[PDB]
Amino acid sequence: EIRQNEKISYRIEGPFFIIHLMNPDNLNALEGEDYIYLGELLELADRNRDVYFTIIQSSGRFFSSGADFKGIAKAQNKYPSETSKWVSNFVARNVYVTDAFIKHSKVLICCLNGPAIGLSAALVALCDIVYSINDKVYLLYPFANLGLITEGGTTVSLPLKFGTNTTYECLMFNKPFKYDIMCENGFISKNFNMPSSNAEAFNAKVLEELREKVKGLYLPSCLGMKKLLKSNHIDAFNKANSVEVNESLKYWVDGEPLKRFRQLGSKQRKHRL
Amino acid sequence: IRQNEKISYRIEGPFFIIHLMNPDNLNALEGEDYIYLGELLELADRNRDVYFTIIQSSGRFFSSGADFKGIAKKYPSETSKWVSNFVARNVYVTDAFIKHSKVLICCLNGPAIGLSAALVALCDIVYSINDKVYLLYPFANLGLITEGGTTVSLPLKFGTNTTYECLMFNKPFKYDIMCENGFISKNFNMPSSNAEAFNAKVLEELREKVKGLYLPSCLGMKKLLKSNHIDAFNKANSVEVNESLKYWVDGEPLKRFRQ
Amino acid sequence: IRQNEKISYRIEGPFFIIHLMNPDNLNALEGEDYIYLGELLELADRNRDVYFTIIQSSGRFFSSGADFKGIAKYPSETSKWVSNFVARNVYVTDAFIKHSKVLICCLNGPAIGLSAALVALCDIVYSINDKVYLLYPFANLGLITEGGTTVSLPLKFGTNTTYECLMFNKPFKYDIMCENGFISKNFNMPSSNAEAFNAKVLEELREKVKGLYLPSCLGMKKLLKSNHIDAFNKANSVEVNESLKYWVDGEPLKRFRQ
Amino acid sequence: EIRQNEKISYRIEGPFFIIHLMNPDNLNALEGEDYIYLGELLELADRNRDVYFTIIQSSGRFFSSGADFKGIAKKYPSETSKWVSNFVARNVYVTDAFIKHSKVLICCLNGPAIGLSAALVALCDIVYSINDKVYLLYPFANLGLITEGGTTVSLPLKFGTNTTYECLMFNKPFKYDIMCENGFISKNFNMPSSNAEAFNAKVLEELREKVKGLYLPSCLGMKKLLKSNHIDAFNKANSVEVNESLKYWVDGEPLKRFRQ
Amino acid sequence: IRQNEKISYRIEGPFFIIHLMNPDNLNALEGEDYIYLGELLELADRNRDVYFTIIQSSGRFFSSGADFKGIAKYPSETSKWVSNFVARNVYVTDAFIKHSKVLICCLNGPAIGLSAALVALCDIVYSINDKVYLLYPFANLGLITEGGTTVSLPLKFGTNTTYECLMFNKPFKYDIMCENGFISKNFNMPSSNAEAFNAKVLEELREKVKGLYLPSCLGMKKLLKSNHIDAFNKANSVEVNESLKYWVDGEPLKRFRQ
Amino acid sequence: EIRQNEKISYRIEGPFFIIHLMNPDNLNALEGEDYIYLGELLELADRNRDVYFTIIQSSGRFFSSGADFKGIAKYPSETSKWVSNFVARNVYVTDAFIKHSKVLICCLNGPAIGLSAALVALCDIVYSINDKVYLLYPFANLGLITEGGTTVSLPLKFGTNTTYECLMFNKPFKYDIMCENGFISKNFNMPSSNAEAFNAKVLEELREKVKGLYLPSCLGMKKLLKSNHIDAFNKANSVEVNESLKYWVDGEPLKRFRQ
């Protein structure tokens, strides 16, 4: 049905399309091709007439550490310019995965087994329902420390779901959206309060409680209600996606993120041993 | 206007008080009852001495919603039948609540369900009798979708994730969610049996709260504040009433109501 | 779908052809006929072999508007006009607004009232000759804009033209249609025989669509619709409810009894 | 480059442009020319390319008691012309100045804010509190006026619709609990109100600590992106507010209420 | 209302008529004259017997715009130009934007500047002959669009025409106005006699208004105005505050002095 | 500052930034890197503070014949390949044309097709060499949908019904339609073979038309005028690229090109 991925898996159980991030030893850090795979999986779930809920689950102690920056400072494709290179490597993947999350017609449920960073936290903030394992989860958007700007439609999603002043304080000064902030704004639906050392039991418990909750309901009604609710901010989200993917290009081409990435991995010690 | 045996009204100074007085049937309303509510709002809106519109109820519930016993209970098709019996009532009452120019105040003497909870969410100020009130929108259990402008009003006043969790799984907007979102302006903390004492206390507090103010200023401020989400509400009204028609036509709400 | 003595339909390949077959009464439509039009559009919208919806008529008019003889029990006048006027208008206007197949109107003659309002909602319009026009007699009847014309007429004819035509009860003539590109093709045929006009329009439509990717047409239409969908929905919702204070006041009826 | 106001001063420290309302004996009540001078200072800070944060501080027990009423009650062919010159212009100017600011706006509340100054506080990006005794008061219904300063958009957006209706229709203050329930105050310093100078100094030190390691052009780009969410709503509200307040000003209700 | 020596008004049945009566100074208006125009529109909008507001003029020009001779006390240049330019402009533009009666303009000749903006901001426009035009010399004066023209010019003439005319200081000539339906009727009278033109317009308006229900006209205008009201009163405050930097810079003053 | 391209050049003359498409033998067909280079040139013009007008000219008998298909006809899937090939270049060049702060002027020396026609419809002022220029958007014939922002730009500048008739049936926007809609500011009525003389005459007249004007005034006026439809253009670009992606993936465009 689709190519296999050693980092992301999926299955179909009745009306549920379960996606599982299964790379816990790298904190579920995703490359661009993994975000494209996520987009393709959401399309597959969206074109299935038996699916009603799309559940994104993860593994380990984090949900996802964000984009995989492994090896970005190495000097060693062959694009004609920096603009073309960064266009192909950033703009397309970001716009594609953000649009795939924006237009999903099934109910998107996120199971937080830990913290989320970067574009992964941006996709977490694009889900309809969020469940957390315990009160030690947070969302971090480190754009000001890396020399970049908002990604994944957070321009609309973060002030909509957390408030304008809170969004400004967290983004201008590079602070995390903690669990208290998420609870003062109704971001998390249920906190399961489970030990952080087992995400498999948390995922199984979430699936069981979801199966309990859907008994006797008319599911086409749920899809129609979501179709009506999505029309509140769809235009804002599309406009924000288009503007963000092209505004980040000037920061990528200016060279500041590469300078900061290089000086991050420049911490050799004077006296060895 | 005409007399209705379930809803009454009166005018006291700048207040236009509407009272649902059918507490033994949990204040369940029919389509003509919603049309009568709309007519009463038009009356209140045309009076130049009226500045506030108070909607009060009686009994243990505020209302139990649309009376389905009058739905099950002439037309060339089912589409025409439901265009006449469902679409028109909803467009009329929802627009009458959306475009009201006087300050709408709801006094929750108990739970509200269905379209009545939708009209509660369209009011400007909501007072509750105690901490046991709630709002229920069982659209997913009845085989229907959002109605009464809840598409815009519920995410606006309770949040997006809360609205999704409550609507997709048929869960009530409880009092704790109301306070976490600032829905109730004042909790009177009175016994749920005596609703008329609650209504009288609300009226006396409103009477003593308007002394020394300039009421045309209140109307101008409301006319300015209404312009924020008026287009969203109008579009939602139209699209809501026209999308819920296929659910009635297919027969799922009627099949589910029969048990 | 039930059977109607005044409207019929057929399916020929990608085309879903609706035909108004009441020429002796100028194709005047009652409320149930507008609800039947809405049902026919919903029927054409839900089958995957249909790509174009073509609305044709007969006689010398396209339609003379709403049949008022039918409009001439309930606990109130408001209930009466909410169930008799508001419901059918909001339903048929939404049915025309949200249609996903390409709407084509073949003007065999003048259109009046809500039928001209529906003509203004089609995507492509052909005329039989240069004698057609659209008339919205809202000012002479005691009513206001209907059928999404609030958004449709200023968008397709201009603001000043719309004000001049609507405030003084003047028709949108054919030269005004040409100044604005309202009519895609003028077939220039005698106004007597509308049947040959419909047959020629169908032959040209059959010749034009071969070699094209029809799902591409549907996708382009889906994208183009998002330009003014919100405006049309707001306009429908506010029109159908503001036009109610005029009915309950009694001016349209009192003007029709004369 | 700019003149000197005896009630408002300014200075530039690195990336910070600090504005100081320095008339605590009269509760920092501002006249029309003072609001125009505030707008001019915001334009000056917006044109300086080394400034990234605009810090607006104040003195005494209040942040500002609003427009100077004793200066309002004052050459013109009619009353319409008089109130177009004296009210509409200054309000539209200062509101557009706060709406379109490119640098990060940070308000330091040393006390209650009332009227148009509260409306300007509601237009700031980040607000700090000296203690838990601060509030905002919009007494438009008690003065015979309507919403001004952009509050039509900013109050329901930051405090909710039902709370805004309850507070505006009945002349009640947005208290500190309402602020905490909506996340309006970013930090509460919990210092005694008898010293706003120490509060301002500590805010400046914390802001100096919190900027190390940040790419500031990225902060400006992120604010530029976030501003475009409600910019059209604010622009639409400005005109309608300043032009609908005129029918209230020319009827004489505000003056006869202040003169009694 | 206070009496003005350059603008008068009268009421005839359902018509509120405003006459600019300074033909020897080419009908140049000052800031107090624009505030007086706003007051007159408020007076017309406040009484229940008026349904149409008609703006007329005299001489060879409809109006030459703002009196630059007049504008050629305050602690700053900004505080001067906020009280002189911004307030009058925002007031008169909001007055013309929110008017609920049917605005009709009788163009007896060219209109320049803010007068041309008010002309383009009306609902119906008549012209005395084919020698009328609108000039917006913002680029030649060191200024930008005013009077809500950012919305009204591309809406009523198109984006490309508006760009070509505003970037290079060219007039919106009569053929351009007749390509977009800006003028509803051309009376084709001699430019020497504007009084006969005004009288002919008035008698034709009296003839056209017979047999209609005028509340229907008012309701239809109320509905049609919601199409672009937000864009209009959103661009007003942005225009008046963006022009302030150009006024404070001193370019329009340095340019007018030669 | 910028690389060298053998199909596009540029220069600066006073306040004019002149871009020249100099590949007449291949009908000025552009590849994806050519569109990225065009966007880079627009950014270069937008950063220069001495430039006020951006002039885009071409050569030969066409203005451009659209995207080069020989280049269209390593990646884990077809979705990834088509994302990286098509979506990025389209969103980038469309955003580059939508947000430009200088006055964009296009000199039509002949027909324009496809994405080049979309960019021509995205410019502020268009001049024509003669009455034989046209615009063609063959999306329905290639199995594609609207691109380059045409969803907003075509109905805005040519009308809704005309746009539907021209897009649904793959018909060109001829010079007649452009004249009835005021799309072309001036027709120069020069011979088709005189494209260089056409460019020179356009430059001379633009140079004579700017004398005396205040240029910051023109830039501020454009900044105000551009906010009429900016959000619509951004939304359209964002939805267009992602919707056309699946038409690309299904394989109909490649199939239709190979025959």
Numbering used by the authors:
A (entry chain A): 4 to 79, 84 to 280
B (entry chain B): 5 to 77, 85 to 270
C (entry chain D), E (entry chain F): 5 to 76, 85 to 270
D (entry chain C): 4 to 77, 85 to 270
F (entry chain E): 4 to 76, 85 to 270
Reproduce, without paraphrasing, sentences from the article in which this PDB structure was first reported.
A prominent example is peroxisomal matrix proteins, most of which depend on the targeting factor Pex5 to localize and function correctly. One such example is the yeast Eci1 (Δ3, Δ2-enoyl-CoA isomerase 1), an enzyme that is essential for the β-oxidation of unsaturated fatty acids in peroxisomes. Although Eci1 contains a PTS1, its targeting to peroxisomes can occur independently of this signal. Using cryo-electron microscopy (cryo-EM), we resolved the structure of the Pex5–Eci1 complex, revealing a novel binding interface in addition to the PTS1-binding interface.
